[model samples]
Target: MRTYTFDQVEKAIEQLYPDFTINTIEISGEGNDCIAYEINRDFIFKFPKHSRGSTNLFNEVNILKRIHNKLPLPIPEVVFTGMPSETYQMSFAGFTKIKGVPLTPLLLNNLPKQSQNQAAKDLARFLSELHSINISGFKSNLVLDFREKINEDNKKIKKLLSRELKGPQMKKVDDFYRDILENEIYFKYYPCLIHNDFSSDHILFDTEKNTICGIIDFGDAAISDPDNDFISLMEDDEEYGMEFVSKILNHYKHKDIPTVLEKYRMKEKYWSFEKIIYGKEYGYMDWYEEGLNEIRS
Candidate 1:
C-alpha cells in the first residue's frame, strides 16, 4: 500500500495524456484506500492506494465499459486506463464527469413533496433498468461474496456493541442480531448483481427537476443479494411515508412490494454497521451518527 502524492499523480496524468494541460486539479475525496481528483472541472480520476483496492478500480473500469449503454442513467465512462508510471504503482482511470449534487438526506428533506415523488420514480426507473441486466454469464471479477459479507457485518456489530452501547441500546443491537440470525434464511436467495453500496452519496439528483440525474460510484457494486439494492431507496421513502416505495413497486411491475421488503431493512440493519467502522477509520462522525439515529428513529 502506498500513499499517493500530488506530484506523483501530476506526472502520471501528464505522461498518460501529454496532449492535455492542467490548469487546476482539486482533491475531490480521499480515504485509506483511494484518493480521487476532479481534474480541471471536466473529468474525474481515481488512484487506488492498496493492492486490493487496485483490483476494485480495475474491476469498475471494465464493468462500466461493458455495460456502457444498458443503464438508463449516466455512469462513469472511462476514457482510457493508464498503466502505472514511475510515480505510481497502480493503474488509474478517468471519466467524463457525471453532473449534479449527491441526493443527501438534507436535500431530500427540503424538496417539495411533488419533487420527492419524481425523485423516487426516476431512481426506481434506473434500478429497474440496472437490476435487469443479465450478468450471469458476464465475465467480471467483482462478484460480492454474500455469506462473507454477512459475517463481516456480524463481526463489526460484535465490536461496536462492545465498544459503544449500553442499556436498551445494547439489547437493541443484541436482539436484532439474534433475530436476524434465525430468519437469515429469508435473506438468502439466488444471486443477482446489485449496487451493493447504493446510498445518497452515489445518487446525483437534479434539484430543479427533482429527478435522479445519474448513479455514480460503481466501485462497491457486485453480484450479491438483491436486498442490498433496496436499502437507501427504502430509507428515502420512509420520510415520505413509504410513498415513493409504492410507486417503485408499481414501476418495478410488482402488484405489491414483497414481504421480504421489511426483512430487507433488517438485512440492511446488520450491514449498515460497516459504515460506522469505516467512518472511524477516516474521522467521519456523521457516518457514525447516521447509524445511531436510524434505530433511534
Candidate 2:
C-alpha cells in the first residue's frame, strides 16, 4: 500500500458516502496498528497498517458488537466499514467517536479523592462485565505458553537486543526470563474475554463527570488470562499504581483476589518482552526500543 494523504482519504470517504456532505476530515493520531481519521466530530475511521492489524480490526468489530450495551461504560460502536481496496490494502472500519481524554496515572491522581474512587469503581465494573461474557467458536490470539515465548525471546536477546543492551541489562533480561519460565503456576489461568491492552491509552476518562466514559482500541482484545487486564493498572507511580489496582480489585467480582494480584505481577514482567517481540515481528523500531528501555530501567 502507498502512503495515503489526508486529501486522498477525504476524497475516498467522500466517494464512499456521496449522499452525505462531509465538512471536515482530520488526522486523529497514528499508532502502531492503525492510522485513525476523525470525521465531522462524530466518527473515526481506522485504517489497519498490516495484515495482522487487519485481522484484529475485524475481530474488534465483532467483539464490540457482542458486548456493545452489556457493560456499564461506553465503547466504540461501528458506524461504517470499508472493504479492502488496492490503495489501502488492509480492511478498515469507522466507529462512533467515544468522547473523553485518554486516561493516565497523573490524570487519575489529579482528580478529587472521591472522584478517584469513583473512577476505580467504574473501571472495575467495566472489566467485571467484560470478562463474564462468553463467546463460542471465536478464534482468540491468547498464548499461555510462557516457556515457549521466553525461549524464543531469549534467542532475540542475542540476535536483536544484544546490540542495544549492555551486560547489566542483559543480566536483568535473563533474570526476568528465568523467573517467569520457571514458574509453572504463573502460566495457568481460566481463559476469558479480556482487553489484552488494558492500559491508560485505551481507557477514556470524562473530565467533567470525573468518571470513566469509555474504552477504545480493542485491536488487542482477546479471550485470555484475566490477570493480564490488571497489569496496566499497576503501571506508573506506586501511589496510584498497586494501591489504585487494589481499590479496583476490591470492587471487582473475582473469587480469588490474592491469586489474581499475584499473577498480575508475572504478566507485568512479561509485557515488556511482548512489546519487544511484537516490534521485532512487525519492524516497529520504536516499540522495540521502548521495551528495551523498560527492561534496562
Candidate 3:
C-alpha cells in the first residue's frame, strides 16, 4: 500500500499541465491503489499507486482514447497522461470530470418503478455496445485470454480455499469450483467482449436524463464470457438476477445466451463465503463485516 501526500500529487499534475493547480483532494471509492482529486472546475486527476502492472493509469488512458467517441454513453475525456515527477513516483492521468451520482446507491428498492426500469435498460444498452467492439485492436496486455485465465484462477482458488477456509466454507468453495470446471462447456458457447468487473461503482447516472451518463473504470475489461460482468448483479439480488440478465442479453440482440444456472448457484454460495475469509485474512474489517452479513443471510 503506497501513500502519497497532496503536495506530491499537485506537483506531478503541474509537471503534466504546467499552469494547472489542484484545489481539492479526496480519497474516493474503494481500492487503495488510487487517489482521485478535483482539479480546477472541470477536471479530475487520478493517480494510481500500485496498479496491476504499474500500468493502470496508462491502460485506462488507452482504453478511454479508444472507446470514448465510439461508446453509446459518455466516458471521461483524457486531458493528460503524465509520467512520474520527482514528488510522486507513479504515473497519473487527468480527465474531464463526470457530473452525476453513482447508480449503486440507487438500488431497486430506492428507485421508482420507471427509474428502475430505465437504469436497467440504459446499463444493458451500454454494456451491449461495449461488448460489440472488436477487441483485436486493443493494445493492452491487461485484456488477455479469459478461458486460460479462468482455468488458472479456478486452480488458484481451489488451492487457496483448501488451505485457508475450514468446514462448510471450504466445502462450499471447492464444490463451486468443481461445478464450474464440470460445466466448462457452457463457457465455450457464449464468448463475447466483457467488462470483467461491471459493478455499480463503474456506472454513473444522470437523474434528469434518466440514463447512464457515464461509464468508467475499465481496469478489468477483457474478451471473455459476458457472464463475468453479471456476477455482481446476480450476487446482489437473486430474485432480480434473471431479469437483469435477460435485459442485458436482449439489448445485445443475443438470441442464445448460455445458461450458467449451476455456476451462478454455486457462485452465490462460494463468493459470499469467500469474501468473508478474504476480508478477514487481508485485515479488511469493513469487507469482513459486509461479507459476514451476506453469507449469513
Q: Which candidate number has the best TM-score?
A: 2
User: Candidate 1 vs candidate 3: which has greater TM-score?
Assistant: 3
Where in model 2 is the C-alpha error above 4 Å?
Answer: 1-3, 85-90, 140-179, 238-240, 255-258, 282-297
Give Cα-based local distance difference scores for all models. 0.71, 0.77, 0.65
lDDT, candidate 3, 1-297, per-residue tens: 365787887787777788765676654543544667766667777777564323656666777777778777788898877875444443887788888877764344477777777777777777777777777776446456645644676665555445455678656655655666666554565555676667777777776776678877665566666666665556544334566656665665755554555446655665655565556555668866676566433
**lDDT tens readout by residue for model 1, 180-258:** 6666555556567677667777888886677788888777678766656665566544333355556666666743256
Candidate order by lDDT, decreasing, is 2, 1, 3
C-alpha positional error of residue 184 in candidate 2 after TM-score superposition, expressed in Å: 2.6
Sort all candidates by TM-score, best to worst. 2, 3, 1
Cα TM-score per model = 0.74, 0.81, 0.76
Off by over 4 Å in 3: 30-32, 84-90, 105-112, 154-178, 237-241, 256-263, 270-297
Question: What is the alpha-carbon lDDT for the whole of candidate 3?
Answer: 0.65
> 1-297, model 2: which lDDT tens digit per residue?
224687877666667777757788888988777889998989888877777777677777877877778878889998777666644433578899999997788888789999888888888988998888875656534433445656877787667776787678788877877877787666677777889878787889889877889999887787777877886567555324878888888898566767776776766666688778887888878888888788878
